[PDB]
Amino acid sequence: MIQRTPKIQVYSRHPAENGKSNFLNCYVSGFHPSDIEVDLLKNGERIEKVEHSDLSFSKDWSFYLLYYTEFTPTEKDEYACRVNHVTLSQPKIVKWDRDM
Amino acid sequence: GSHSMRYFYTAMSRPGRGEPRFIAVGYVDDTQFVRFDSDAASPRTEPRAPWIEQEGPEYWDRNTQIFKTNTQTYRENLRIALRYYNQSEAGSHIIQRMYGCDLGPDGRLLRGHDQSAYDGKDYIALNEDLSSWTAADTAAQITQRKWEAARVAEQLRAYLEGLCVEWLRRYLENGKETLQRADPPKTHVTHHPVSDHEATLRCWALGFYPAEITLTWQRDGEDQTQDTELVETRPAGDRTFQKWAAVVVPSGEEQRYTCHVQHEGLPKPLTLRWEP
Amino acid sequence: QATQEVKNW
């Protein structure tokens, strides 16, 4: 079947400031079919309370979803998003880089 | 400004895991306002924007009935599509539909839309005349002939020119403080050395609504399209969007580069540069 | 406001 692999961006709602509460976003888009597994990670471990948007799609029929959770960034804590999809042979991990 | 309403339907089969799931979402511009999910504990149309909450019980009941009927109709359509493509009952497949209306700046209908897809590929579309169809393949031509015989286009035209426009105008009025407010981007340029002889300039746009925006880099006044890394516009989660554009430049040449931003919330396009 | 389906595929 013709399938499309997800694009992934990991970023914060507001410019990151250590010790200030914020939201950590993982935006997955451009994928088809719609089933997808997304985890947000803190120091490699799954964050329990993650919400996501309702399934919708772009003009080219590919799907997109926003997964998000409240977080308070620090200098040392590492955050990431881990994505699985039928097009991937292994989960793809994208690290949060506060400059992107 | 100009405005649109769109509904997006996704029907997904899952043999061995129950009947196909049907999801519908409705948008005005880049603002979602309703959802329906046949997998919910109690499937019903649910509000997703504050300005829709004031609609009365008749509105919620009418839309819920539509989406409950559509759940059944799209389960049938998924079975039909297997016949049209000679496919087995073992695989998972997806039908999508998107339809709605666009208004110009004076509130007049600009055009209507109604398109469907099967497995992420165009299947059939209502033409701009709201009277004829374009079928993508010989399967969709079967649907086209059925819809021609049943005069489906005439019913869609009546919705798109009538109820679609009337309700969009109502939503725009009820939600005017947000739907009719453009939030301009907050913009800045950052500088990231990559080596002793090159650096990245990244032009940021944050906090903007609606999502449409243009961000470009020029070098000596010439667009740098091939050399620009441009990320997809992305939601912040507070209704607004974010985007950036980056170029790698020779150290010492940074002032030859300008970032240009166009957005409907800006009275004039902006020009920015790295400000060390 | 959504529209009703008119016919199957």
Side-chain angles (χ1 to χ4, degrees), chain B residues 238-263:
Chain B
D238 57 10
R239 103 167 188 137
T240 75
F241 296 88
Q242 311 181 345
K243 197 182 189 69
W244 58 253
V247 284
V248 176
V249 315
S251 281
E253 298 196 350
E254 286 90 343
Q255 297 304 307
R256 294 170 65 184
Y257 288 81
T258 51
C259 174
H260 300 264
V261 186
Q262 289 160 84
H263 186 268

Side-chain angles (χ1 to χ4, degrees), chain B residues 7 62 74 77 97 146-147 159 171, chain C:
Chain B
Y7 284 88
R62 172 161 73 270
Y74 279 87
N77 292 341
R97 187 184 177 195
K146 182 180 301 196
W147 291 0
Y159 166 76
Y171 299 151
Chain C
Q1 168 65 54
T3 196
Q4 313 97 281
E5 284 305 313
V6 183
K7 281 294 279 203
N8 290 105
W9 284 24

